Every structure is written in structure tokens, then in C-alpha cells.
Design a protein around this motif. Structure first.
Motif, short mmCIF file in Angstrom:
data_model
loop_
_atom_site.label_atom_id
_atom_site.label_comp_id
_atom_site.label_asym_id
_atom_site.label_seq_id
_atom_site.Cartn_x
_atom_site.Cartn_y
_atom_site.Cartn_z
N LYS A 43 -1.74 41.01 -12.31
CA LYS A 43 -0.49 41.54 -12.88
C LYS A 43 -0.43 41.49 -14.41
CE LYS A 43 0.85 41.87 -8.52
NZ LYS A 43 1.00 43.15 -7.77
N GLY A 44 -1.44 40.89 -15.04
CA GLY A 44 -1.51 40.82 -16.49
C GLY A 44 -1.13 39.46 -17.03
N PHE A 45 -0.92 38.50 -16.13
CA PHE A 45 -0.61 37.11 -16.48
C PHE A 45 -0.98 36.21 -15.30
CE2 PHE A 45 3.25 39.23 -15.00
CZ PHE A 45 3.68 38.41 -13.95
N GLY A 46 -1.08 34.91 -15.55
CA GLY A 46 -1.43 33.99 -14.48
C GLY A 46 -2.06 32.71 -14.99
N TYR A 47 -2.78 32.03 -14.12
CA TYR A 47 -3.14 30.65 -14.38
C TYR A 47 -4.32 30.44 -15.32
CZ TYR A 47 -0.11 29.62 -10.32
OH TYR A 47 0.95 29.53 -9.45
N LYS A 48 -5.14 31.47 -15.53
CA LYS A 48 -6.35 31.28 -16.32
C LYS A 48 -6.01 30.77 -17.72
CE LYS A 48 -10.56 33.45 -18.06
NZ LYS A 48 -11.62 33.49 -17.01
N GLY A 49 -6.65 29.67 -18.12
CA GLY A 49 -6.43 29.08 -19.43
C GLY A 49 -5.29 28.06 -19.51
N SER A 50 -4.50 27.95 -18.44
CA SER A 50 -3.35 27.03 -18.42
C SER A 50 -3.75 25.62 -17.95
CB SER A 50 -2.19 27.63 -17.60
OG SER A 50 -2.53 27.75 -16.23
N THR A 51 -2.79 24.70 -17.87
CA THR A 51 -3.13 23.27 -17.72
C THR A 51 -2.47 22.60 -16.53
OG1 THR A 51 -1.30 22.35 -19.09
CG2 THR A 51 -3.13 23.19 -20.27
N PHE A 52 -3.02 21.45 -16.13
CA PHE A 52 -2.26 20.48 -15.34
C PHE A 52 -1.52 19.60 -16.35
CE2 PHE A 52 -3.52 20.57 -10.83
CZ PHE A 52 -4.53 21.54 -10.89
N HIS A 53 -0.20 19.79 -16.46
CA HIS A 53 0.58 19.15 -17.54
C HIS A 53 1.26 17.85 -17.10
CE1 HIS A 53 3.73 21.40 -15.37
NE2 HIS A 53 4.53 20.45 -15.81
#
Length: 164
Positions: A43-53
Motif C-alpha cells: 500500500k506504500g507504507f508498512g513495517y519495513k525499517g520500523s522497530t520493536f519499541h
């Protein structure tokens, strides 16, 4: 068949390995579809590059805030929030994949993987899958958490997508 998706996770820039998740589309298709599409990024956004915060030993590892990286953000493929689909699946033990939220009917993109049975969350968080492979990686992530949820290493979803 139900989708299999993967998260490849780094800690401080070094690879921990791969978590493979079964999404229970048979039970919670709307919730499974949201997670699946956020994994592929289609969809043009999502989890890639994000973190377990937020990671708490003997509890769970939380991730999915790909907008604010701190627990305040995220969004679903449907809009900012979507309803609790059902509470059919329970928090039966380690490896359960479930939606984090801000109360009833506020699912976005934040999720958690349990490292214990979290039965008190039954009927409050929508369970939508479980770990097929990579509980060792989950335990590594867990070991980098704290009582407060603050991580002692930077835990990053370096790559993610759909296996089948």
C-alpha cells in the motif's frame, strides 16, 4: 491456506534472524489482511525499517509503530483505526501474535508477540496468529527489553514480507 509472513530483525545493526508468522485469516481475515499488507508494503507504507519499541521480559515484544516509533503512532490499511474483529483466538502461551491497541476498536498497526501466556488480555486484544519459526529470535528480542519496556539495543525490522 493462511498467509505466512516474515520479519527479519536486527539488534544494533547486526542480524538476529527471522521470525515467521502464520496469520489466522480463517478466523480473523480483516486483521490478518492488515498485517499481511503491512509486511509486503504493497500500500506504500508498512513495517519495513520500523522497530520493536517496547519489550518487557517475561511478557511480550511490541512493534508496529512505523510512523512515530514510540507507541503513539501507526495506521491500518483501512484508515487510522479499525474495529476488534473478534476475540475467538486466545492468548494461550508464548508465540501468540496479537494486536496492541488504545482500548476497544482502536486497532492500527501495532502488534505484540507474547513470551508467556497472557490470559488477562483475552477479550481485550485481537489475537490473529502465532510464531511458526524463530522463537529463538523472539527470545533474543525479549532479552533486550526491560521492566519499563525500554529496549537496551535498537531492534529494527530490517526486511519483511510474505512467504506464501
Amino acid at each position: 491456506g493462511n498467509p505466512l509472513v516474515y520479519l527479519d530483525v536486527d539488534a544494533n545493526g547486526k542480524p538476529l534472524g527471522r521470525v515467521v508468522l502464520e496469520l489466522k485469516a480463517d478466523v480473523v481475515p480483516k486483521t490478518a489482511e492488515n498485517f499481511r499488507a503491512l509486511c509486503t508494503g504493497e500500500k506504500g507504507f508498512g513495517y519495513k525499517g520500523s522497530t520493536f519499541h517496547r519489550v518487557i521480559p517475561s511478557f511480550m515484544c511490541q512493534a508496529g509503530d512505523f510512523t512515530n516509533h514510540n507507541g503513539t503512532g501507526g495506521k491500518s490499511i483501512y484508515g487510522s483505526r479499525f474495529p476488534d474483529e473478534n476475540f475467538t483466538l486466545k492468548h494461550v502461551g508464548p508465540g501468540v501474535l496479537s494486536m496492541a491497541n488504545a482500548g476497544p476498536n482502536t486497532n492500527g498497526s501495532q502488534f505484540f508477540i507474547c513470551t508467556i501466556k497472557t490470559d488477562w488480555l483475552d477479550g481485550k486484544h485481537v489475537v490473529f496468529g502465532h510464531v511458526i519459526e524463530g522463537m529463538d529470535v523472539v527470545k533474543k528480542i525479549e532479552s533486550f527489553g526491560s521492566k519499563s519496556g525500554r529496549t537496551s539495543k535498537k531492534i529494527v525490522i530490517t526486511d519483511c514480507g510474505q512467504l506464501s
